[PDB]
C-alpha cells in the first residue's frame, strides 16, 4: 500500500508550471491579426465571418 | 470515477434493437457515456405506438423534483416531453416548428390550388 | 401561472390535507432578474489563451 | 474523437461555415419566447431547491425527529 | 444395493405404528391445504394427555450433501436433468 | 333520518358470514401446484384442537367478503387546450407518472392528444398503465377472451362460477363495468340453475346474497336452505329483505303478526314471493319432516 | 394420409381403434428414444417429419397421423400436463418433438383460454387498499381562466406582431446576410385538399 | 455426516433464527463464564448455542470470552458513549439471558420493519434493466408494445433499409 514516488512528475509539473509564467505570450502576440486574411498569426484560427 | 468538472443531467439513454428504439430516462453525469452509468432511472420512453396507438412516457415526477433542486440540467427532447406533459412550459421551438409546418403546409396549398384551378 | 400539470398536483395536495381554497397557485418571477445576452461579464474569472504559437 | 496533439485534415483546410439567414420577424419573437421560457423555469427551479434544503434540514433537526430522538434516550435510561 | 434396498424397505416405520408407540395423533402439514391439520393416524390405546417436551436443539445428526443443497452450494452439471418417464 | 344498512354493516356482515358458513375441506381444497413432501408432527388431542382452531382464524380470512361499489363514473376532464400543436404530431402521448409512494387511484396520467389537448385518462386507459409499471400477479394488459359471453357459457357449463370470480377479481377493480357485468350475469346463471351450494363457504357469497336482495330474486336460494335444514339462514334471508325493504307488504305484515321464525317465511312467501305456492310447500315438507325425528 | 377426424379429432380418442392401440395409458407410454449414454440429450429432435417424408422412429405424435393436435382435443392435451401439478412436461419426458411440443404447449394455452382445460386458478388480493375516488385525479379539475376564454396557458404562445424599430435593429444588425421577413402565421393548420 | 456436536449450529438457517439485533451504541460485548458449578450451566450454554446467532447479525460487535476468571459469570457491553451495562447471568437459562438482552439493548420489532421496508424501495418495478437489478430489460417484454425484432421481423415499412430505398 506504499506507493513509490513519482519524482519526475512533480519536478516536470513545476518547471511546466514556471516556463508558463517565464515565456508567457503578450496580449500584442496572442490578440494580433492580419487584416487581408483575417487570421490570428500566434494560431493560425481564422476568425468568424460575422466579425470580419 | 472521477470528472474533471462537469455536471448531472437528466437525459435519455437509448437502449433497443436495430429499428426498434426504446430510451429509458436517467440522471447521470455529463461526461459519461450515453448508455453508460447513471444516478438513477427516472422514468422510460417509447416512441413506437402501440396497438393502441398511443406513446408510453413513465416520468417519476417525485424525483426528477429532487434532481432539479440539486443542480441538475435537462437535454432538449427531454425538456419537450415534458411541456408535452404540462410539467413544463411548451418549448419555444416546439411551438416556432409547428409555425414552421403551418406556413409550409399552406405554401403546398397554393401551388396545389392552381394546378387544379389553372389545369 | 403553474403549468397545467403541477397545478393539478398542488391543488389537489390542498384538498387531501383539507384546506379549501379557491386562490390559484402562481410563480413569483420578480426574483429572477433576467438580463441580456450582451450583458458584460466578470473578465476576472476568465481564461487566457496558453503558449502554444503555430 | 481526435485529441489536441492530433493534426488537421487537407480536406477541412479551406473550409468557412456562413452562418444561417435570419428572418426578423421569427428571430425576435423567437428571441422573447427563451426570455419568458428560460424566466418561468428558473422559478421553479428555485422551488424545488428549497424543497431539498427543507427536508435536510428537517431530518437532522426537525420536530418530529428531535421528538423520537429524546423518547429513544429516555427509554434507553 | 439390492440386499439392502429390501432392508430398509422392511424396517421403516409406519404412521399407525409410531401412533401406537408414544400414544399421539400424527397430523400431516401440506402447502397445498393451507394449514389444516390432517389426520392420517391415531393411537388404538389411550391418547397421552402429556405432550412431548419440546426441544431447543435437536441433536440429529445431519448430512453435509442435503445440507449444502439447502443453502445453494451444491454445483453439478448432472444433477435435475431432464429424462424420460419412469 | 333513517338510513338503509349497507354491505359493510356490522349487522349485514354477520349475517351474511353465517349464511357462507364454514368448510375447511372446501375452504382449503388441495391445490393443483407445485408439491413438496409433507411435513408430521406428533400432537395430543388438546394440541389437535388448538391446530383445527387456527385454521379456521386463518379461513375467516379467506373467506373475507370482498366490498360492493358502484359503477365508477367517466373520468371526462381537461386541463389545458394547445391548438398551437394541432398537426404536429400523428399519435398520443400517454404519461404516467411512477413513484413508488402513491396509491394507484390518487396516481396522475394524463395524455397528450394529436390536437394539443391535454386530458386525463380514462379508467381503461389508467389501469392498464398501472399494469405496465406496477404489475401485478394475475392480471393482463389486453382483456382476455374467457369473459366473452360464449366463453362464459363454457365455464358455466362445467360449474366453475367460483373460478370465473376469482379471474374477475384479479383482471378487474370492483368498481368497474366488467367486474359488476361478470359478476351479475354469473349470479343470474346460478339462479336458473340452483347452483348455490358452489358459492358456499367462499368470499363471494354475500355478494350474491346483495344482489338478488336489492333485485327481488330470493326465491330460489330461500327454497335451496329449507331443502338443507338451514332455516335459520332461510329466515335471517327474510329478516334481510324486511330490512332493505321496510316499506313491503312482508315488512309491514311481519309487525303486525309479529312472526317469528318460521312464521315469516310464511308471511313473505304469501305475500311477497313470486313463487308462494312452491316455497308453501317445500316449507311444508320440511316441518313434515323434522316432527318425525323431533318424536 | 388424409385423416377422417381432421374436422373433429375428439371422435377418435372416444373409438375403438384408438382402445385397441393404447388401450388407457397415454400413446407415449410405450416410447423410448435411440441414444447413446445413459443421459440423453437436454432437447428431442427439431421434427419428425422433413419434405413430406418421416423419420425411421417417430415420435408418439408423428407416428399417428390421426392424432391432430388442437385446443379442443382436451383429452389428448391431458396426457401431456401433470394431473398433480398441472404442468406440462418437458420433451424428454414423453419423447415428442420440438415442433409438435411447440403446438402442445399453444394448444394447452389457447384451451385454459377457451375454458376448456381446469387449471388452478389463484385467490389473489385487491391491488388498491382504498376504493374513494375523491381526488383531482379521477375527478374534475377547476378549469383555469385562460381555458374557459379560449385562450392560451401563457401569452407568449401566441404569434405577437413585433415593432418596427425592432426589426430595423436587426437588418442592420444581420447585414446582407437576411430572410424574407415572415408574417403572424394562420390560426389554424391548413391541409392538402 | 457433519462433523461436531449438534452440527445444526453450523447451518445458515440456524443462524438467521436469532431475535437479538444489537442497536448502534453496543460496540463491545464481553462474556466471562466459569467452565464448572451447576450455577453457571446456562451461561456455557449460551456460548454453545447464540453466540454464533448474535454474532451472524451483528457482525461489526467485538465479542470476546473469558474463562473462569470471576467466580460467577456475567456480561457486559460497553458502549460509544463510555457507559457500561453489567449484567449477572447466574442462575438463569440461555433462553431468559437472550430474552434479556434483547429488551435492554435489542432492537423491537417495530425498529426493524422500518429498516426493512426502505429497500424495497430501491427496486422500482417500473425501471427497466437486467434481471439482477430490474425485472424487465426491454419494454418489448410488455404485450400490446411492439416486439423484438429477433422474435417477430418488423414491417418493411418500419426498417431503415427501405426507408431509405423506397425514398431513393
Ligand atoms: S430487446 Fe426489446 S427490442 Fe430487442
Ligand atoms: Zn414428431
Redesign the interface.
Known sequence: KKVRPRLIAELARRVRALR?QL???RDS??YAVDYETLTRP???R?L???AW | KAYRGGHLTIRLALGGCTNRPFYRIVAAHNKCPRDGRFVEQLGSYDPLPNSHGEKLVALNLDRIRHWIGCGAHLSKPMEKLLGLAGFFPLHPMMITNAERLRRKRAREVLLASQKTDAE | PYPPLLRAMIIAERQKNGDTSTEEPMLNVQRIRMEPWDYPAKQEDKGRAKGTPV | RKTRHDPLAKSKIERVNMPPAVDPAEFFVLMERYQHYRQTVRALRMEFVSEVQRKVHEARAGVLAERKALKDAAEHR | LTQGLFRGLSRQETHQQLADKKGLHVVEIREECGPLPIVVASPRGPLRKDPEPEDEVPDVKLDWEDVKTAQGMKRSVWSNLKRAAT | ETKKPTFMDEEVQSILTKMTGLNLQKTFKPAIQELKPPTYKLMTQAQLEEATRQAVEAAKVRLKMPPVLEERVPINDVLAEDKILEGTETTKYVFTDISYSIPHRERFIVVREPSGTLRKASWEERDRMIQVYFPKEGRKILTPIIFKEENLRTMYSQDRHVDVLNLCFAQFEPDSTEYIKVHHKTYEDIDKRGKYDLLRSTRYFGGMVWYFVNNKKIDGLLIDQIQRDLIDDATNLVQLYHVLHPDGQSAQGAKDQAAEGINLIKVFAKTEAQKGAYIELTLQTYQEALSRHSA | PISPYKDEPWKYLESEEYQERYGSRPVWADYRRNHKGGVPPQRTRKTCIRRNKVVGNPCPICRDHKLHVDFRNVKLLEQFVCAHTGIIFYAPYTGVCVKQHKRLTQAIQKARDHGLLIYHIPQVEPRDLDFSTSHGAVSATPPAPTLVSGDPWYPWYNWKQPPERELSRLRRLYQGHLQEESGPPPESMPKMP | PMKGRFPIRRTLQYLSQGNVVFKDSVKVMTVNYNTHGELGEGARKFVFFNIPQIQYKNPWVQIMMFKNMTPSPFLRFYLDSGEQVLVDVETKSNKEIMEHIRKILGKNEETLREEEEEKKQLSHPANFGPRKYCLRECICEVEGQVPCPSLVPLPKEMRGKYKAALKA
Open positions: 508558463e515565456n508567457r505570450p502576440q496572442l500566434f494560431s493560425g481564422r468568424p465571418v460575422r
